[PDB]
Short mmCIF file of C-alpha atoms and ligand atoms in Angstrom, two decimals:
data_model
loop_
_atom_site.label_atom_id
_atom_site.label_comp_id
_atom_site.label_asym_id
_atom_site.label_seq_id
_atom_site.Cartn_x
_atom_site.Cartn_y
_atom_site.Cartn_z
CA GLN A 1 20.99 101.86 45.51
CA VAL A 2 20.39 101.56 41.75
CA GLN A 3 19.46 97.92 41.16
CA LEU A 4 18.05 95.97 38.22
CA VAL A 5 15.33 93.31 38.51
CA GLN A 6 14.66 90.87 35.67
CA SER A 7 11.81 88.50 34.84
CA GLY A 8 12.01 84.74 35.24
CA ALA A 9 13.24 82.11 32.80
CA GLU A 10 11.40 81.41 29.54
CA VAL A 11 11.09 78.46 27.16
CA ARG A 12 10.16 79.08 23.52
CA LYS A 13 9.66 76.86 20.50
CA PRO A 14 12.13 77.50 17.65
CA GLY A 15 11.01 80.18 15.22
CA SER A 16 8.86 82.02 17.78
CA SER A 17 9.69 85.09 19.87
CA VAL A 18 10.33 85.90 23.53
CA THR A 19 9.93 89.03 25.64
CA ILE A 20 11.99 89.77 28.76
CA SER A 21 11.27 92.52 31.30
CA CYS A 22 13.83 94.52 33.27
CA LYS A 23 12.76 96.85 36.09
CA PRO A 24 15.16 99.40 37.62
CA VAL A 25 14.97 99.84 41.39
CA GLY A 26 16.36 103.16 42.59
CA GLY A 27 17.83 106.05 40.67
CA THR A 28 16.25 107.59 37.60
CA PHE A 29 14.50 106.13 34.55
CA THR A 30 15.26 108.38 31.55
CA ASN A 31 18.89 109.43 32.07
CA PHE A 32 21.04 106.36 31.41
CA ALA A 33 20.76 103.78 28.64
CA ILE A 34 19.90 100.17 29.44
CA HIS A 35 22.33 97.90 27.60
CA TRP A 36 21.48 94.23 27.13
CA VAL A 37 24.27 91.65 27.15
CA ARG A 38 23.71 87.95 26.49
CA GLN A 39 25.87 84.85 26.89
CA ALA A 40 25.44 81.61 24.99
CA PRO A 41 26.45 78.46 26.93
CA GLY A 42 30.24 78.25 27.01
CA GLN A 43 30.69 81.39 24.91
CA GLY A 44 31.75 84.99 25.41
CA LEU A 45 29.71 88.04 26.31
CA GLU A 46 27.68 89.45 23.42
CA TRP A 47 26.08 92.89 23.23
CA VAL A 48 22.50 92.84 21.93
CA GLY A 49 21.50 96.50 22.07
CA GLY A 50 21.02 99.56 24.19
CA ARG A 51 18.24 102.10 24.66
CA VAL A 52 17.71 105.20 26.77
CA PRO A 53 14.11 104.79 28.00
CA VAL A 54 11.54 107.34 26.78
CA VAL A 55 14.19 109.60 25.21
CA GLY A 56 14.41 107.26 22.21
CA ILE A 57 18.17 107.00 21.61
CA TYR A 58 18.79 103.36 20.76
CA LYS A 59 21.02 101.04 18.72
CA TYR A 60 20.74 97.35 17.88
CA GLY A 61 23.58 94.91 17.36
CA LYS A 62 24.26 94.12 13.72
CA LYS A 63 23.48 90.44 14.34
CA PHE A 64 20.13 91.31 15.95
CA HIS A 65 18.90 94.08 13.65
CA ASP A 66 15.62 93.14 11.90
CA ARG A 67 15.00 90.63 14.76
CA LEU A 68 15.15 92.84 17.86
CA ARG A 69 12.84 95.46 19.37
CA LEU A 70 13.59 97.41 22.55
CA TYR A 71 10.81 99.37 24.24
CA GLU A 72 9.59 100.47 27.66
CA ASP A 73 6.42 101.08 29.66
CA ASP A 74 6.65 104.55 31.19
CA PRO A 75 3.79 104.01 33.72
CA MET A 76 5.32 100.79 35.10
CA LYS A 77 8.94 102.01 34.76
CA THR A 78 9.85 98.75 33.01
CA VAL A 79 11.99 98.13 29.93
CA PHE A 80 11.42 95.19 27.59
CA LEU A 81 13.45 93.18 25.09
CA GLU A 82 11.76 91.31 22.23
CA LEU A 83 13.71 88.91 20.00
CA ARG A 84 11.96 87.20 17.08
CA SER A 85 12.64 84.13 14.94
CA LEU A 86 14.44 82.34 17.75
CA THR A 87 16.94 79.58 16.94
CA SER A 88 19.35 77.42 18.93
CA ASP A 89 21.99 80.19 18.77
CA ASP A 90 19.69 82.41 20.87
CA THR A 91 19.75 80.10 23.90
CA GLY A 92 21.56 81.78 26.77
CA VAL A 93 21.38 84.15 29.72
CA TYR A 94 20.23 87.72 29.03
CA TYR A 95 21.34 90.55 31.32
CA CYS A 96 20.07 94.12 31.42
CA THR A 97 22.85 96.48 32.47
CA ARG A 98 23.38 100.17 33.08
CA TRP A 99 25.90 102.65 34.43
CA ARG A 100 25.17 104.00 37.90
CA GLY A 101 26.38 107.49 36.98
CA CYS A 102 24.81 110.13 39.21
CA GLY A 103 22.38 107.50 40.51
CA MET A 104 19.59 109.61 41.98
CA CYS A 105 20.31 112.38 39.49
CA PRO A 106 18.63 115.58 40.67
CA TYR A 107 17.40 118.01 37.99
CA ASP A 108 19.74 116.48 35.42
CA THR A 109 17.43 116.04 32.39
CA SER A 110 20.49 114.79 30.46
CA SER A 111 21.02 111.57 28.50
CA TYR A 112 24.06 109.28 28.71
CA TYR A 113 24.55 106.37 26.30
CA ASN A 114 28.27 105.50 26.05
CA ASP A 115 29.16 104.17 29.48
CA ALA A 116 30.47 100.98 31.02
CA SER A 117 28.09 98.72 32.93
CA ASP A 118 28.66 98.42 36.68
CA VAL A 119 25.03 97.51 37.47
CA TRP A 120 23.80 94.12 36.24
CA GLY A 121 20.54 92.28 36.64
CA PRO A 122 20.48 88.67 37.77
CA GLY A 123 20.02 87.47 34.19
CA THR A 124 17.11 85.78 32.42
CA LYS A 125 17.59 82.24 31.12
CA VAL A 126 16.08 81.78 27.65
CA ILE A 127 15.88 78.18 26.43
CA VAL A 128 14.98 77.67 22.76
CA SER A 129 13.52 74.16 22.64
CA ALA A 130 10.41 72.55 21.18
CA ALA A 131 10.25 70.16 24.15
CA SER A 132 7.78 69.74 26.99
CA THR A 133 8.47 68.68 30.57
CA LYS A 134 9.92 65.17 30.48
CA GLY A 135 11.57 63.00 33.11
CA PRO A 136 14.96 61.41 32.48
CA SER A 137 15.87 57.89 31.50
CA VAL A 138 18.85 56.50 33.40
CA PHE A 139 21.34 54.21 31.65
CA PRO A 140 24.39 52.56 33.23
CA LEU A 141 27.99 53.16 32.20
CA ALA A 142 29.49 49.68 32.68
CA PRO A 143 33.30 49.24 32.94
CA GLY A 144 46.24 51.20 36.74
CA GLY A 145 44.05 49.34 39.19
CA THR A 146 41.33 52.01 38.82
CA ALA A 147 38.07 51.59 36.90
CA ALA A 148 35.25 53.97 36.04
CA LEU A 149 31.49 53.53 36.07
CA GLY A 150 28.63 55.96 35.97
CA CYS A 151 25.10 56.91 35.01
CA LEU A 152 23.97 58.53 31.77
CA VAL A 153 20.93 60.66 32.62
CA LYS A 154 19.43 61.32 29.20
CA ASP A 155 16.51 63.06 27.48
CA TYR A 156 14.93 65.17 30.21
CA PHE A 157 13.49 68.67 30.27
CA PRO A 158 14.02 71.07 31.77
CA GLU A 159 17.11 71.63 33.90
CA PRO A 160 18.15 70.66 36.63
CA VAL A 161 18.77 67.06 37.69
CA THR A 162 20.45 66.04 40.93
CA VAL A 163 22.70 62.96 40.96
CA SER A 164 24.21 61.29 44.02
CA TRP A 165 25.76 57.88 44.66
CA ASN A 166 24.70 55.44 47.40
CA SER A 167 22.29 58.02 48.86
CA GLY A 168 25.24 60.41 48.98
CA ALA A 169 27.51 58.10 50.98
CA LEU A 170 29.93 57.76 48.05
CA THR A 171 31.41 61.15 47.18
CA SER A 172 35.13 60.57 46.62
CA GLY A 173 36.01 60.45 42.94
CA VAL A 174 32.54 61.55 41.78
CA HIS A 175 32.19 63.83 38.75
CA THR A 176 28.76 65.07 37.68
CA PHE A 177 29.19 66.83 34.34
CA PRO A 178 27.20 69.88 33.22
CA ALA A 179 24.13 68.99 31.21
CA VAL A 180 24.35 69.49 27.45
CA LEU A 181 21.35 70.42 25.30
CA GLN A 182 21.22 68.03 22.35
CA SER A 183 19.69 68.75 18.96
CA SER A 184 16.37 67.14 19.97
CA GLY A 185 15.84 69.94 22.51
CA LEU A 186 16.28 67.67 25.55
CA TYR A 187 19.01 67.76 28.18
CA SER A 188 21.54 65.01 28.87
CA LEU A 189 24.33 64.60 31.42
CA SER A 190 26.53 61.91 32.93
CA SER A 191 27.85 61.32 36.44
CA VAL A 192 30.91 59.13 36.97
CA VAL A 193 32.90 57.63 39.82
CA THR A 194 36.38 56.08 39.87
CA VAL A 195 36.98 53.12 42.19
CA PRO A 196 39.61 50.40 42.62
CA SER A 197 39.20 47.69 40.00
CA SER A 198 39.21 45.13 42.83
CA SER A 199 35.96 46.63 44.14
CA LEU A 200 34.01 45.77 40.97
CA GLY A 201 33.17 42.21 42.02
CA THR A 202 32.53 43.37 45.59
CA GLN A 203 30.98 46.79 46.06
CA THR A 204 27.51 47.84 44.95
CA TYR A 205 27.22 51.15 43.09
CA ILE A 206 23.82 52.84 42.89
CA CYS A 207 23.22 56.31 41.47
CA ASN A 208 20.29 58.38 42.73
CA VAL A 209 18.69 60.65 40.11
CA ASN A 210 16.33 63.48 41.05
CA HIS A 211 14.33 65.56 38.56
CA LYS A 212 11.90 67.81 40.45
CA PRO A 213 10.17 69.38 37.40
CA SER A 214 9.00 65.81 36.68
CA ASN A 215 8.76 64.49 40.28
CA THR A 216 11.16 61.66 39.41
CA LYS A 217 13.26 59.93 42.08
CA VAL A 218 15.02 56.91 40.62
CA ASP A 219 17.76 54.48 41.70
CA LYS A 220 19.88 52.62 39.13
CA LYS A 221 22.28 49.79 39.97
CA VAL A 222 25.52 49.90 37.97
CA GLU A 223 26.85 46.39 37.40
CA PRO A 224 29.88 45.28 35.36
CA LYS A 225 29.41 43.08 32.31
CA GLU B 1 33.35 97.83 12.69
CA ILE B 2 35.80 97.54 15.61
CA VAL B 3 36.91 94.02 16.62
CA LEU B 4 38.45 93.15 19.99
CA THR B 5 40.86 90.23 20.41
CA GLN B 6 42.33 88.88 23.63
CA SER B 7 45.44 86.81 24.29
CA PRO B 8 46.10 84.34 25.62
CA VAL B 9 43.07 82.05 25.42
CA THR B 10 43.89 80.63 28.87
CA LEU B 11 46.17 82.04 31.57
CA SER B 12 47.53 79.75 34.29
CA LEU B 13 48.74 81.39 37.50
CA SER B 14 50.39 80.29 40.73
CA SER B 15 49.63 81.88 44.09
CA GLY B 16 52.07 84.79 44.20
CA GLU B 17 52.27 85.04 40.40
CA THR B 18 51.32 88.17 38.45
CA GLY B 19 49.70 87.88 35.03
CA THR B 20 48.91 90.24 32.16
CA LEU B 21 45.88 90.04 29.86
CA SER B 22 45.99 91.70 26.45
CA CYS B 23 43.13 93.32 24.54
CA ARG B 24 43.86 94.04 20.87
CA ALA B 25 41.65 96.42 18.91
CA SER B 26 41.21 96.33 15.14
CA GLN B 27 42.02 100.04 14.77
CA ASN B 28 43.32 102.95 16.84
CA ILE B 29 40.73 103.86 19.50
CA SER B 30 40.66 106.23 22.46
CA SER B 31 41.41 104.85 25.92
CA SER B 32 38.18 106.41 27.24
CA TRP B 33 36.07 103.64 25.65
CA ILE B 34 37.66 100.47 27.10
CA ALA B 35 36.27 98.52 30.04
CA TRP B 36 37.29 95.27 31.74
CA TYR B 37 34.87 92.74 33.21
CA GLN B 38 35.28 89.75 35.50
CA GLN B 39 33.07 86.67 35.36
CA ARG B 40 33.09 84.18 38.21
CA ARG B 41 32.18 80.60 37.41
CA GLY B 42 28.72 81.07 38.94
CA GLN B 43 27.94 84.80 39.06
CA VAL B 44 26.88 87.79 36.97
CA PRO B 45 29.77 89.75 35.40
CA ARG B 46 31.48 92.42 37.48
CA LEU B 47 33.03 95.66 36.22
CA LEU B 48 36.71 96.08 37.12
CA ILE B 49 38.01 98.93 34.94
CA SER B 50 36.40 101.71 32.93
CA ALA B 51 38.15 104.17 30.59
CA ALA B 52 41.20 101.89 30.22
CA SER B 53 42.59 102.76 33.66
CA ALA B 54 39.79 103.98 35.96
CA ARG B 55 39.21 101.43 38.71
CA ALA B 56 35.56 100.80 39.51
CA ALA B 57 34.16 101.42 42.98
CA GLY B 58 35.02 98.70 45.46
CA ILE B 59 37.67 97.16 43.18
CA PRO B 60 40.96 96.41 45.01
CA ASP B 61 44.46 97.72 44.11
CA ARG B 62 45.21 94.18 42.78
CA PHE B 63 43.79 95.06 39.31
CA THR B 64 45.26 97.87 37.18
CA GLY B 65 44.51 98.80 33.57
CA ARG B 66 46.71 100.47 30.97
CA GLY B 67 46.91 101.00 27.24
CA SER B 68 46.86 103.31 24.23
CA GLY B 69 46.26 103.14 20.49
CA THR B 70 45.27 99.54 19.73
CA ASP B 71 46.82 97.55 22.61
CA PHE B 72 45.30 97.49 26.10
CA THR B 73 46.36 95.38 29.07
CA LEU B 74 44.98 94.30 32.43
CA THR B 75 47.52 93.38 35.11
CA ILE B 76 46.63 91.08 38.01
CA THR B 77 48.88 90.85 41.07
CA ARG B 78 48.44 88.71 44.21
CA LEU B 79 45.75 86.68 42.45
CA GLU B 80 43.11 85.45 44.91
CA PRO B 81 40.47 82.68 44.64
CA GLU B 82 37.74 85.21 43.86
CA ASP B 83 39.76 86.45 40.88
CA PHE B 84 39.93 83.16 38.94
CA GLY B 85 37.37 83.22 36.16
CA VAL B 86 36.77 84.71 32.72
CA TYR B 87 37.96 88.23 31.86
CA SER B 88 36.43 90.22 29.00
CA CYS B 89 37.40 93.59 27.58
CA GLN B 90 34.67 95.80 26.13
CA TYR B 91 34.60 98.72 23.71
CA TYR B 92 31.70 101.07 24.49
CA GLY B 93 32.36 104.00 22.16
CA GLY B 94 30.36 104.87 19.09
CA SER B 95 26.98 103.29 18.38
CA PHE B 96 27.67 99.53 18.58
CA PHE B 97 29.36 97.97 21.60
CA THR B 98 31.61 94.93 21.33
CA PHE B 99 33.23 92.46 23.71
CA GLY B 100 36.46 90.55 23.45
CA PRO B 101 36.34 86.76 23.27
CA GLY B 102 37.43 86.51 26.90
CA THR B 103 40.34 84.92 28.75
CA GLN B 104 39.91 82.25 31.42
CA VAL B 105 42.32 82.48 34.35
CA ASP B 106 42.69 79.12 36.09
CA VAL B 107 45.00 77.74 38.78
CA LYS B 108 48.44 76.59 37.66
CA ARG B 109 49.66 73.11 38.55
CA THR B 110 51.89 70.36 37.23
CA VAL B 111 50.74 68.80 33.96
CA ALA B 112 48.79 65.57 34.49
CA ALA B 113 47.66 63.17 31.75
CA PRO B 114 44.02 62.02 31.56
CA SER B 115 42.80 58.53 32.30
CA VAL B 116 40.59 57.58 29.35
CA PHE B 117 37.59 55.23 29.46
CA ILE B 118 35.04 54.21 26.84
CA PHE B 119 31.55 52.99 27.73
CA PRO B 120 29.50 50.79 25.36
CA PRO B 121 25.78 51.45 24.93
CA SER B 122 23.63 49.79 27.56
CA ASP B 123 21.20 47.08 26.49
CA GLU B 124 18.41 49.14 28.08
CA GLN B 125 19.14 51.97 25.64
CA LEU B 126 19.44 49.75 22.55
CA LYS B 127 15.84 48.59 22.81
CA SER B 128 14.86 52.32 22.85
CA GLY B 129 15.91 53.09 19.26
CA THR B 130 19.02 55.18 20.01
CA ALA B 131 22.58 54.39 21.10
CA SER B 132 25.06 56.51 23.07
CA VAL B 133 28.77 55.77 23.44
CA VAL B 134 30.42 57.70 26.27
CA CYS B 135 34.13 58.54 26.52
CA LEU B 136 35.52 59.76 29.85
CA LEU B 137 38.67 61.86 30.34
CA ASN B 138 39.45 61.93 34.04
CA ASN B 139 41.56 64.31 36.16
CA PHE B 140 43.79 66.00 33.58
CA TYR B 141 45.62 69.31 33.28
CA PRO B 142 45.72 71.60 31.30
CA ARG B 143 42.09 72.25 30.36
CA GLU B 144 42.30 71.85 26.58
CA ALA B 145 41.98 68.33 25.18
CA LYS B 146 40.69 66.93 21.89
CA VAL B 147 38.39 63.92 21.48
CA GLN B 148 37.70 62.41 18.05
CA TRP B 149 35.28 59.55 17.44
CA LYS B 150 36.28 56.87 14.92
CA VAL B 151 33.62 54.37 13.83
CA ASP B 152 35.48 51.78 11.73
CA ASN B 153 38.29 54.37 11.48
CA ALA B 154 35.80 56.83 9.91
CA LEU B 155 36.08 60.23 11.61
CA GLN B 156 32.78 61.66 12.86
CA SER B 157 31.48 65.22 13.06
CA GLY B 158 28.22 66.86 14.08
CA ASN B 159 27.02 63.78 15.99
CA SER B 160 28.99 64.24 19.21
CA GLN B 161 28.77 66.57 22.21
CA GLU B 162 31.12 67.05 25.15
CA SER B 163 31.21 68.95 28.42
CA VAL B 164 33.86 69.71 31.02
CA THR B 165 33.72 70.02 34.79
CA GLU B 166 34.81 73.14 36.60
CA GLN B 167 38.43 73.07 37.72
CA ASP B 168 38.59 71.21 41.03
CA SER B 169 39.28 73.38 44.06
CA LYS B 170 41.31 70.57 45.65
CA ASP B 171 43.67 69.06 43.05
CA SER B 172 42.99 71.66 40.30
CA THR B 173 42.34 69.13 37.52
CA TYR B 174 39.67 68.92 34.83
CA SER B 175 37.34 66.13 33.72
CA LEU B 176 35.61 65.68 30.36
CA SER B 177 32.75 63.56 29.03
CA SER B 178 31.99 63.03 25.33
CA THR B 179 28.77 61.39 24.11
CA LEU B 180 28.47 60.01 20.58
CA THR B 181 24.83 59.77 19.51
CA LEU B 182 23.81 57.00 17.11
CA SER B 183 20.51 55.58 15.94
CA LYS B 184 20.04 51.89 16.68
CA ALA B 185 20.00 51.11 12.95
CA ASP B 186 23.32 52.92 12.45
CA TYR B 187 24.82 51.23 15.52
CA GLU B 188 24.16 47.74 14.11
CA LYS B 189 25.98 48.23 10.79
CA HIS B 190 29.39 48.99 12.27
CA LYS B 191 31.85 46.99 14.34
CA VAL B 192 34.68 49.24 15.62
CA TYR B 193 33.99 52.06 18.09
CA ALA B 194 37.05 54.02 19.23
CA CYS B 195 37.80 57.15 21.27
CA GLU B 196 40.90 59.09 20.19
CA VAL B 197 42.23 61.47 22.86
CA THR B 198 44.84 64.19 22.34
CA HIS B 199 46.36 66.00 25.33
CA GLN B 200 49.60 67.72 26.30
CA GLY B 201 50.23 65.12 29.01
CA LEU B 202 50.15 62.25 26.48
CA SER B 203 53.24 61.57 24.37
CA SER B 204 51.02 60.28 21.54
CA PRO B 205 47.23 60.12 21.02
CA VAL B 206 45.69 57.49 23.31
CA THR B 207 42.88 55.32 21.92
CA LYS B 208 40.36 53.24 23.87
CA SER B 209 37.92 51.10 21.90
CA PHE B 210 35.59 48.11 21.91
CA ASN B 211 33.74 45.95 19.40
CA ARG B 212 29.96 45.60 19.45
CA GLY B 213 29.27 42.52 21.53
CA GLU B 214 32.80 41.21 22.13
CA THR C 1 -11.53 69.67 28.68
CA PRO C 2 -8.18 71.47 29.16
CA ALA C 3 -8.03 70.29 32.79
CA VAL C 4 -5.35 67.74 33.67
CA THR C 5 -4.67 65.49 36.64
CA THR C 6 -1.34 64.18 37.93
CA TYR C 7 -0.63 60.44 37.68
CA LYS C 8 2.19 58.55 39.40
CA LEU C 9 4.24 55.63 38.07
CA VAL C 10 6.00 53.20 40.43
CA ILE C 11 8.96 51.28 39.01
CA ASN C 12 9.97 47.96 40.59
CA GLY C 13 12.75 46.82 38.30
CA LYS C 14 15.66 44.52 38.88
CA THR C 15 18.05 47.46 38.43
CA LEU C 16 15.77 50.55 38.23
CA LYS C 17 13.56 51.44 41.20
CA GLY C 18 11.70 54.65 41.92
CA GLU C 19 8.79 56.75 40.74
CA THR C 20 7.86 59.46 38.24
CA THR C 21 4.76 61.49 37.42
CA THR C 22 2.91 62.92 34.44
CA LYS C 23 -0.03 65.24 33.81
CA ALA C 24 -2.69 63.84 31.48
CA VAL C 25 -6.34 64.40 30.64
CA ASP C 26 -7.28 60.82 31.54
CA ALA C 27 -5.66 57.60 32.72
CA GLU C 28 -5.62 56.14 29.20
CA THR C 29 -3.40 59.00 28.04
CA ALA C 30 -1.23 58.64 31.15
CA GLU C 31 -0.54 54.93 30.57
CA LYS C 32 0.75 55.52 27.04
CA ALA C 33 3.19 58.07 28.45
CA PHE C 34 4.24 55.71 31.24
CA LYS C 35 4.64 52.69 28.97
CA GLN C 36 6.91 54.74 26.72
CA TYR C 37 8.88 55.88 29.77
CA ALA C 38 9.32 52.27 30.91
CA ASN C 39 10.33 51.05 27.45
CA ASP C 40 12.81 53.93 27.16
CA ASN C 41 14.36 52.72 30.43
CA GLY C 42 14.28 49.06 29.38
CA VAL C 43 11.83 48.07 32.13
CA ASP C 44 9.53 45.21 31.08
CA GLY C 45 7.10 43.72 33.62
CA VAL C 46 3.47 43.56 34.93
CA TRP C 47 1.24 46.65 35.23
CA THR C 48 -1.25 47.29 38.03
CA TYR C 49 -3.33 50.38 38.68
CA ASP C 50 -4.86 52.08 41.73
CA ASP C 51 -7.52 54.58 40.66
CA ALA C 52 -7.77 55.95 44.21
CA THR C 53 -4.19 57.27 44.18
CA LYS C 54 -3.92 57.59 40.36
CA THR C 55 -0.86 55.33 40.53
CA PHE C 56 0.49 52.87 37.98
CA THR C 57 3.06 50.24 38.94
CA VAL C 58 5.38 48.16 36.74
CA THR C 59 7.25 45.29 38.41
CA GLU C 60 9.85 42.89 37.02
C1 NAG D 1 47.87 103.75 15.18
O1 NAG D 1 48.59 104.98 15.36
C2 NAG D 1 50.02 104.83 15.33
C3 NAG D 1 50.60 106.20 15.64
O2 NAG D 1 49.91 107.22 14.94
C4 NAG D 1 50.45 104.29 13.98
O3 NAG D 1 51.86 104.12 13.96
C5 NAG D 1 49.75 102.97 13.70
O4 NAG D 1 50.08 102.50 12.40
C6 NAG D 1 48.24 103.12 13.83
N1 NAG D 1 47.58 101.83 13.65
C7 NAG D 1 46.32 101.70 13.24
C8 NAG D 1 45.81 100.29 13.12
O5 NAG D 1 45.61 102.67 12.99
#
């Protein structure tokens, strides 16, 4: 039934602007308002604004007034969000949402704005970074009878990287942390493994790092000092 | 104009346990403008409740909403693996919508103290112009833990970043990594690098450290 | 010209082994990117080039 399709991820230099597209599939186009909700990494849901297409009833969030424009293309039945003067606080996932309501409303010609959102788009990832595609550099993390070693996969762009240990043969005690975006605009994560301290002189520990946007496949040997 | 607050920050539940989430409004509002949303760790948000008490289509009897005036509650019974996640209340009356800060509902288990490790900068990284010191907090519960970097006993701020793993499905613990970012020039001036860890499972703050070189 | 080609780097280090790629206008621009990548990873060795496969190699 009523379903919302959103455009793919976008990367924008700081200070510039980005435009997302949301296309409803099913139902009507001018009855129910499209409300945009965004989420910054590790933060709560934030309402950006809402607009009934064509009809012209719209409101912007106080934080996004003077920076936000919501509009539509009536021929293509597509709504757009434009945010200007992007900063690091604008990095996040942007969802277009609406209320299903009467769905395929027949002869309604009525406008509804204040409703909950039970229909969500997949979300559009917006990354505010002045960085270009860059492969990662891999640094070792050298170490009650248990020790820890790992790999620091640093300064790559964009997401994601895949990390395994011993071609994937070592999986017990492995923690690959979520990548953090540092102030330089590049991503960085670590992957760790806990082993018995007796195994340090014995076992070999190799982490396999994959970054497909850069076509990087790299093996690093982690040795104790 | 209307601010929504939720309590608690984190809610820990056993299998059969029943928990209650609170949504506190800044002023007296009508129950017709309150919704509840569920956010799984890797999914788009889902609507659970509209108009304070109206259950959305396809939402089981497990979730019920109540409230009046300024205090609204969501009650969860027979919590199931799908249900663990972040819960947000929303006000959608008037012109400007607002969300609550959210409450994470995780799996309850016995408190377990973290194992703390500190990792010196690799020699490969030093000849690159930057230096990263990594501190690892392994398999702890509950989720919240504080990490403070002390370079020659001088507290740091703004030059560290940390991230946490999702709660393990097996043993229901958390893991944390903190990276302190230093320029090579700054790294050479100082001698003491320490990681101060504060957690409920530790009787007193645990500190792991090393000295540049040895 | 705004047209780029893809160049490969092969890493034969004592602890770091693998490969990465970059898009550059010419090989001279590609090598500067690869030599920075190797220095960032602490790999210091000999460089060879194969213009047929647009492939650099650094071995320790
Ligand atoms: C809400 O209404 C109740 C009952 O009228 C009143 O006692 C209370 O003080 C009001 N609180 C606010 C914040 O308006």
